[PDB]
Structures are given as C-alpha cells and as structure tokens.
Amino acid sequence: TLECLSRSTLLCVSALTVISYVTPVFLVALLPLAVVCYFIQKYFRVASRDLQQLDDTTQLPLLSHFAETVEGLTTIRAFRYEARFQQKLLEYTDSNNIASLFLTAANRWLEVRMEYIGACVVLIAAATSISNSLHRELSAGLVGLGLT
Amino acid sequence: RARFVSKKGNCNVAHKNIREQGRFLQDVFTTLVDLKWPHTLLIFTMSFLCSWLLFAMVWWLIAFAHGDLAPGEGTNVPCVTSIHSFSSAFLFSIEVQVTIGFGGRMVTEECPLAILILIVQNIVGLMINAIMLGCIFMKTAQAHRRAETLIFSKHAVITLRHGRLCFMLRVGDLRKSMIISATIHMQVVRKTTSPEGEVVPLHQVDIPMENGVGGNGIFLVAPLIIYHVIDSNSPLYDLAPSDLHHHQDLEIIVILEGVVETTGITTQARTSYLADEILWGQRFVPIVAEEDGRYSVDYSKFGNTIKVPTPLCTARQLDEDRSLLDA
Amino acid sequence: RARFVSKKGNCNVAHKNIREQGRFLQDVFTTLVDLKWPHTLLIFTMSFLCSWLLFAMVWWLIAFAHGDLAPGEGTNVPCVTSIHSFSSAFLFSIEVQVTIGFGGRMVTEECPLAILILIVQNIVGLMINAIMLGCIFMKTAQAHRRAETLIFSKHAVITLRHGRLCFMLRVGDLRKSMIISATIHMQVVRKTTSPEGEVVPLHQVDIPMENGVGGNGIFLVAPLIIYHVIDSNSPLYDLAPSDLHHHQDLEIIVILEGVVETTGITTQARTSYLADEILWGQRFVPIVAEEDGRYSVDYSKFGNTIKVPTPLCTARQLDEDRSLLDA
Amino acid sequence: PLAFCGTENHSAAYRVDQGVLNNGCFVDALNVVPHVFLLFITFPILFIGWGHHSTWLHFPGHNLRWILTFILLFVLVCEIAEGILSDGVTESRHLHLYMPAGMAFMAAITSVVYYHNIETSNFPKLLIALLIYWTLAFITKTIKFVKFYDHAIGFSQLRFCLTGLLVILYGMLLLVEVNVIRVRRYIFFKTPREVKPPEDLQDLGVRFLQPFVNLLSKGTYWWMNAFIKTAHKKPIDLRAIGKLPIAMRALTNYQRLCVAFDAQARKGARAIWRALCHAFGRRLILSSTFRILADLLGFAGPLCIFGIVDHLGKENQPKTQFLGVYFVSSQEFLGNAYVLAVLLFLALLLQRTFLQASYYVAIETGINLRGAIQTKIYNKIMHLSTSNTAGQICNLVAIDTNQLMWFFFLCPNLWAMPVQIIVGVILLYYILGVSALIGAAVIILLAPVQYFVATKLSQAQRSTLEHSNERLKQTNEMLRGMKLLKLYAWESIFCSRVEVTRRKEMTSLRAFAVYTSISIFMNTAIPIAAVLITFVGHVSFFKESDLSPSVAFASLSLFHILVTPLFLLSSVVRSTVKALVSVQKLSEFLSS
C-alpha cells in the first residue's frame, strides 16, 4: 500500500508537471481545480472513514448470530422460536447491507467527481495546447504529450 | 345519498327559484372579481379592444366629415394629422388610449370636436383603466388557493379520552404562513324532528370545541387534533357504534376561519364527515417527532388512525354505567 | 433540546414528506407576495425584460419577413418605420410596452399582423403591469416589520399575587400606532400522556388569561403585565419550583394578534418561554413613572424582574395548606 | 457589426423577395423564436418556484426523456461546432449559423430543469408549456429540413444530418409529452389519476434514495452530496444512515431467489447458477452493457488524440450552398481539432459516468445477491438435522458468500475485458501497421505472467500463514502464563523461542516479498518494454513508415488503455474460479 501510494502520488504530480510544461497557461486553471479536488478528497475521506468503521462493526453481529444459531439450534427449534430468529437475522443482514451499500455509494461519488475533474483538465489542456500549436510556435508532439 | 359539504369544502347545495331583481349584476364588481382568471382576462381584453374600436370609429368619422380623407393634402389642415384610413384611425386611437402616442398622427389645434373627443378618450381611458387595475388588485388578493392547503384528516375517530367519549379530527397548515387568529366551528348537520311537530331538513347544531379557555380558536403550525367532548347537552349523545354506516342521516361539518398572515385577508377552509367517514375505536397516530434539533412533523402518517380498544356503546350508556358502578 | 417557537416568534417546526399536488404554486400570487423584497425585485425585472425581449423578437421577425430589413428604403413602406436591427426592434418594443414611444419607430397603417401584434403587446403589457402593481401593493401592505417591535420580556416570573400563584410576562408596544383590538392567547406546550393510553408529542393546552371581563384582550400603549392565575382546572397546577430547569419538557407560547392602526391589517407577535426562561419568586420592576406632566415609561427596566420572598412549592400544595389552616 | 444574416453584398441576405419561407437565414431565424418562447415562459415560473420535504414522483417516460435530452444537448453542441466552423471563411460572422442552435441549447437545459421542477412538485398541468414547445421546435425544424431539401442540400453536408437528428429528437420529445398527457390525464379531462409517490420514499428513515432520483442524479450520485456534507459536521450513526428500500431487502431478494429456484426446479451447482441467473441477470447484463459502452467510449480517446495531432501537425472550405452560406462536410468537421477537442471532452465525460454507473450497478446486484444467499443458507440451517461443523457454516457465511459476491462485483469485467483487449489490439494494428502487433503481443504477455505471479504469491501466503499461526499459539502461551514466567524469570527463554519461530516466519516472508516485488516490477516494466520494442522495431527492424507525432502518441495512449485490463484479467479469472468453488461448496451444504 505504501508503494502504490508513492507511485500514485508521483504519477499524478508527474502528469500535472508534464501538462504544465507543455501548456504554461493551464497552471492558472490548475489552482481552482486543485482546491475543488482537495475539498472533495477531505469530505470523502471523513465520510468513507465513518462508513468503513460502521460497515466493519455491523458484520460481527451477523457472523456471531450465525454461530449462536448453529450452537443452540435444537433449543431454538424446541421453543418453536424459528420465526423470531429469522427476523433477527433479516435485521442484522439488512444493517450489514445498508452499511456496505452506502459505503459503495460514497466510493462512486468520489470517483465520479475525480473523473469529472480529470475531464475538465483534459479539456483545458487540449484546447490551450491546440491554440498554442496553431497561433504560437508550440510544437506538434508536445501537444500530444500533454494530451495523453 | 347527498351530503351537505364535499370533502374539499365545495358546498353541495343547489338553489332554485331565485327571484333576482338584477342584484347578481348590480354587484358587477365582485362578479368581475369572482370571474375565473381566464374569464377575467377575456373581460379585460374585451373592454380594451371595444374601447379602442369605439374611439377609432369616432376618429375616422370626424376625419371623414372634416374632409380629411380626400386627397389634395397640401391646401387644408387635418383635424388630426395623417389619418389616411380606418387603420390610421385605429392606430391613433390606440396610441391615445394607451398613451404611447408615437406622434406620427397627432391631434392639431385645428377643429374642436376632436379636442373634445380626445378629452373624452383620455378620461374614459383613465376611468376603465383604474377600474380594471382595482378589480385585478382585488383579484390578486384573493385567498382561495390558500385554503386549498389547510387540510383535514379524511377520517374522524371517536375514542375514549380521559374517561369520556371524544370525537376527533386532525388538521394541518402546510405553509409557513401562520393563518392568524384561527377559529374552528363544528356543526352536526342532521335532520331534526321537534316534539311540537317541526321537522327541518338540514338542521345545524353547533357542537362546542373542547378548550381549556372555553373558546373556539387554535394556534396552527404543527398538525393538531381537534376533539369534542360528547359528555352531554350536545349532539352525538346517543351515537351508538352501530349507527355509523353510509345511509345514516348524520353529517359533521367543520369550518376554520382566519386571516392569512401575508395578504391580511380572512379565509375559510371547511370539510365534512358523513356517518361512514367517521371511524369508531380509533386514535390518531402521533406525528411530531423530535429530530436532530427541531420538532419534525411527518405528514405521511397524517390520517392513519390506529385502532385502540374502546367500549363500543353510546355515551349515555357510558354515563349510566359510571353511575351504576359508583352506586 | 428543541423548542416549539423561538424567542423571536420564528416557529421551529420542520415539515417533512409533504405530498404537494402543485398547491404551493397554484397560489402563485401569495407566493409572489411572500418572496423577499430582493426576490420580488428580481421577479419584477425578469417579467419585464423577458416580455420586452419577446415582443422585440416578434417585431424584428415581422420586419424581416415584411422585407423591411433590406436596403432600398425609398420604394416600399415599412410595416413599422425605421426598424434597422434587433436593436431598433428592441427599442421599439420597449417604447410600446412602457408606452414612452418616442415615435421615431412608429407602427404604420401598412401591414395588419403588426397591428395585431401591437394590440397583443399593449394588452399583455397592461395585464402584467397591473399584476405587478397589485402584487407589490399587497407587498407594500405587509405588516411583518410591525410585529418586530411588539416585544415580550425575556423572563417570565411566577409570583404570589392576591394569595394565589400567578405566571406573568410583560409586553410592550414601542410605536405610537395602537395595534387595535389586541388579543392574547397563551398555550402550555407540553407532552401529554392520556389515561386511556394516548401520548401526543406537542400537545397545546390553552391557559386562560386573567381578566375582570373574562376575556383575552388588552389595551396596549404602556407596557403591561400579562398574568395567568394558576389556581386550578388549568395546566401548571403541579409546577414545583424544582421542575424549572433546562431539560424539563415544558414550554409556554404566547401569541398576540391585532390589526395595525394604520394599514388596517391583522398581525401577530409570538414568543415562547422554556422551563429555564421562566423564573420563580420574582416580580416585574415597575416601569411607568409620573414625569413632568405625562406618564413616562422607562424601557430600560423592561425585563429586570426583582426577586421577592414567595412560598416555594406547588400551587396544589398552596391550596392544601390554605385548607389545612382553615380547618 | 453583428448582423444575423451577415452583411454581404449590402446585406442582400435579408431580401425576402423570393418567397420568404425559402429564404434561408430566415427559416434559421424562425428557430430562434420557440427557444425564446420556452426561456421566457419558464424563467419567471422557475424563479417563483425557486424562491418542506416533498417525496417527489416520476412522470412516466422519465428515463426516456432524460436520455433524449442528453442526446439533444449532444447534437446541439455538434451544431454549434459545425456553425462556428462553417463561417470561418467570410468576413462578417453569420450569426444565424450558430446562435439559433446555441440558443436551443440553453432552451433544452431549461426544458430539463423545468420538467424536473414540475416532476418534484407534481403539478402536471404546467407540462402544457412543454406540450407547446416541442410542437414549435418540431415544426420550425421540419420547415428548416424541407427547405434544405429543396436546394438539394442532401446528406453530403453535416448540417443536414444534424437538423434531421434534431427533427427526429423533437418528434421523440413530442411523443413523450403526449405519452405523459395520455397516461395521467392532467389536461381538461376526467382528471382521474393520482399516483401517490412510492411507499419506500415516504418512510422517514430510508435515506439511501439512489433508486428515487432522476437519471442524471442516478448517474452522478448527486444526492449523496447532502448526506456527505452532514456526515462531515456530525458523525455517522445508524440513525443517520437510512434503512434499505423495499426493492433491496433481505426478504425481497430472498423471495425473488426462491421464485427463481422454483422455476429452475420445475425444469446441484448448475441449478444454483441458473437460479442466480434467473434472479439477477437483468441487472447483471445492464451493468455489463454500461461497462462495454464505457470501454468503447474510452477507446474513443486515443483515436481522437491521433486526429488532433494529425490536424495540427499538418499545414492548412468549399460547398457554399445557401446562396452565400457555407456548408462544412463531415470530413472537414472531424478534422478541425477544435471540434475534435470538445468531442473528446464530451466522450470522456460520458464514458467515465457510464463506467462508474456500471461499477455501481454491479456492486448493488452483488450486495443483493449476498443478502439473498445469506437468508437462504440460514433458512436451510433452520431445517437441518442434529446429526451433523459450526465453524464450517460460520466461514461459509464469512468467506464463501464473500467470494460469490465479489465474483458478482467483477462479473461485468469478465465479459468486457476480452472485448477491451481485442478492440485495443485491433486499433493499435490499424494505427501502427505490423509493428503494433509485436507491441501488442509484448504487452499481452503481461497477463499470464501476472497470473503465475499471483498463484505463487498465494502459495507463499499459505506457507507464511502456517508459521504465523504457530507463532500466534506460542505468543498466546507466553501471554497466558506471563504471571508464572515473571515469577521465575523464564520470560527471556520463551521470548527466545518466540523469536526463533519469528525468524522462520521471516524466512517465508522473504519469499512472499520477493513475489510481491516481482509483481510490482512486472506490472510497471512490461508496458515500458512494449513501447520500446514497438517504436524501435517500427523504425529500425521493419524500416516501416516514419514515426509521426499523431501516430506515435495515439499508440502510446492505446498502450496506457491496454495496461489495466491485461493486469486485472488475472485477478478476474482467479476470483471466478474461487467463486465457482464457493458455489460448489454452497450447493454441497444446501443439499444435506
């Protein structure tokens, strides 16, 4: 995880440096998008932390209930208490599901927001580099570098 | 069977054989306010178009009689300039009634009957314009659509409260505007036969709303339960749980009146419960719940009316049983 | 904990799950009155600019289709004169909607669809103009800022008056305008559990205001003390001096309604005391003082509430002690 | 200065002497009118309503009209583009080219906003205002089509295709409007229908309103916003999180699965697989469709970079048709590199939202499957006999259902990664000729190597878990009897034995870490080697075509797009076989 975090941070910094070297004007638009990115990242991080802790903590009651039902199965069938225990299981599994579902929805929210920021970055880079490769002397291949 | 008032306040009575002495249109003005907004639009536009057509009529007529529609322009002075047709006359009339007056066809100092007509045209224009302004101000301050959002529970329930049979409904004010000084009147509409031999077909007996102050008035922000104690000396005293079916001659109308907070005009919302609408042995489900930091009202459960064990018998028998248990 | 009504009358309830059938905007008009003055400004200006842009659209379109934007001016007659661009069309439209009509670009007798459009433009102009006039007359007669200067003492006090426990507040009318026919309603908002098993979450019990005439109405010029006798048969009967802390479920709302003397429109000022706001064993400091030749009211000491030795116990125990001392 | 029909031959474009309706740039002017109508009828109502808690309701045809308006905004961006491109020639800017289409754009956006306001407020009669609009927008566009046809504009030019697409889309929206007016008769009629918004949306406590939002919010998870903001101020409690909607409950999914099981029993592990299909295949293939569309639209990127760099690396329009108006064709249009840029942007945005929506639908169907399977295995626990392994059932709920659910998470990938790799190799070959096949083979070699490395890594993981379990038992011995050890100071000797076991565990961890390092290095180095061999062999060995900026950078972007599926295909296949074993075990258990 530390290796992959290093690689991700350095690749992102490297891509931003490349498309700033190809396009000096993009750097002016980078700061608003950087601010938006930071805010989104912070709000996600806090929400995802809470949701992950909750999603973990609701899974222990489910496995625990399964263990109990297997241990005292003959007793529960003796009491004819099967319906109550099935109700308790539905409740536990619904808590687990709603936790996992909200977790995945926050994940999707973050990833869509980051992909839209990336789309705005690619539009700005494309437009400005093409404009400079038309009006100015900016080379042809540097435009493709910044584009990728 | 017919009811007295619909569930939406629309009263169901039909009035027949009304000798009118012209009194329904001697009040042309509230008639012209109560004309629905499309009808008011059409009256508005008729009263403008007809005026313009009238005074354009007069203008073209004058310019005719003044010899101003004959060619040979340069020698004589027009009574108003460059009216060439009834089109020109119609445009000149519009311009002087609606006061745009481009001035391409302006009245000149030449012939007085035009001066007099233009006085008349301005004055009647001012008159009808102020008449319509005022009528549609009165129509901008109509508060019928505000009483469309004061709602009553579809089912009224009779339940045992504090040892006595009580007839309850629930009402709610959807908007933030406090309909100031709300007052509720409830009447049991039922055919009453008199011991002296008089039967009235839509008799209305007011039933007292139970208040600690002994009045008829509510502070309506969160939906509240309006209940009436059926102890005695008021109708519904002999209301057995069996007599609550469809074809029972029994209705209860409720009518709440109060000024709207904003346009400062009194309004009224009313509804009716027939003998089948009113349920027995139910109690209204709670609505207010203390949320994060406020009193959140859930309107989903507005008229759910959970059932609860109540003694199914008449209130007179309830008092008789209490008296027998006491002695 | 949440309260029912803030100290500034702003009610604290939140309404959820409201099935609206388009009823909040079927009343477009009181919605358009209640839009705050900046919002009303923006709606006003939108509804004018959009109309001008619309009819300027039509005018430029007609002059296009009439062949009036082609050069070669002298041969043919414009359908309205010297429209040269959508600028000219926009100015002509403004001049005929707002009726300035400089007349540099006047409609001519030439082509009828312009005549018909100019009829339509005048009539819709009159219509929207009268609509906005009336809505902002209704908005000039809004009396919300008048109830901002009817003030209640921040602390309500329970004191022994004429041998009985009385709950008092003090109210004041800052302006010279007598808010005519003032009437005060007080309700003890508290969760009530019924002996038959019904718990309502924001129950409102009206508490009777003590008057010699037996009514709810005050003559409000000098700040006066509104007090309620807690003898019996009304809430607060079992209010021990210990139960007056923050998290006690007990609130008292007060609501005074009356028409303003000047715009002749009913208004309402309301406030609330939680169990901590209400003090025990205090009495309001006198305010009126006979000055040089008048009754000078000093608003500095409005809510000072000096303390005075009172028997700290419930009113029921007060009546029990009186009965025991009597026999 | 700023003439609608640009000032030409002394503004000869305005002379309508020829039968007004067949003067272009007047029929183009007629379009500006219905869009002004919509804007100016709506903005007042929208701002009065913009000046409670609703539990909104959807009008029928909801998703369809959203899709249609998305396509509409797309064609209108293309029309703005073709116009602005189409008057680069002349000296005066012909506004009638783009300003009417750019006006229709804002009009369409207002249309979506206004319809959404009406949907939320359930005032269907207001929809009459849209009922007019499309009509006008239909008519005036058809009038524009017909007249085009008269001068034999044809299909040869792009503007004609775009205006035909527009006529079609306005016809579609008119049909949808009349559909709405037909189902729920809100216009002057018997006024019969009141839909009573769904029950699960009225539950104060169902805060996961993902199914109950308009398609745009469904795609952007826009609702989450509110939640997350709240979740930032005060922590998240089980009261703040809602409870599941009726569509996704343990009971609902369990009954669906049981109906599927009955249908399959009317016609073993195969039975369970076919039942899971019959129960969740609709959502599964919907997610797969989103995923494949996202794959293709992501491939739409490198080719667009190719086009852009080929245009600008060159050094640079005919068909003036409407007696002065120029008409750019599809071939000049797709070679502008300003149009290409915004088309890349639109395609990228749409592809990424489709990809995230595929992910979400797959996740949701997997979680519903987990719920149903848990309830089923518990209902089977209820009935089994006392003759029969408690921990086995506990982990069957803990790890086997987990592997099944993760197979259902990655299941769209299983179908859309081969398609991705195939189309990527094909596009690379089409761009770079024969050397691209060598490069693509070199990069495809990453997948089997990664699979082998993962298998060796799991083997090392088991061999490490053995020593880890033994060291844990020794630590537990040391920690239970710590009292007695400290009483006779035997702590150091037991610590030395624990350290010997730790050294053996480190001996195994060395091999585990070597395999992990090999994985990382292969993953990052196979693409570099692929690019190297591709370009060098293209230039030196093959003596092939000269390496242009467009061609080379298109191939580089295609390699970057090819990296990920080749790396994750190993994991997808491993998860598939793992979940196959899990379903086998689950059938073996459920059969007893």
Ligand SMILES: CCOc1cc(CC(=O)N[C@@H](CC(C)C)c2ccccc2N2CCCCC2)ccc1C(=O)O
């Ligand atoms: C893109 C991450 O969002 C997900 C995405 C999915 C479904 C999915 O096609 N995954 C692809 C990864 C993407 C980048 C292709 C994948 C495929 C094979 C093996 C592992 C994985 N992975 C899934 C775990 C995390 C990333 C590696 C499920 C779950 C999630 C999630 O938010 O946890």
Ligand SMILES: Nc1ncnc2c1ncn2[C@@H]1O[C@H](COP(=O)(O)OP(=O)(O)OP(O)(O)=S)[C@@H](O)[C@H]1O
């Ligand atoms: N059918 C009717 N429609 C409208 N108004 C009526 C009708 N009948 C009576 N009235 C009014 O009711 C009042 C008294 O009613 P009646 O005593 O029944 O008739 P009346 O008073 O003898 O009629 P008058 O006074 O001789 S015109 C009168 O002022 C009438 O104007």
Ligand SMILES: Nc1ncnc2c1ncn2[C@@H]1O[C@H](COP(=O)(O)OP(=O)(O)OP(O)(O)=S)[C@@H](O)[C@H]1O
């Ligand atoms: N959530 C809500 N929001 C707004 N109004 C409501 C709501 N629930 C009920 N009402 C109104 O309250 C009245 C009666 O409420 P209920 O008895 O609870 O529901 P209902 O009457 O059965 O609904 P109807 O009459 O079949 S549309 C109806 O006229 C509704 O218009």
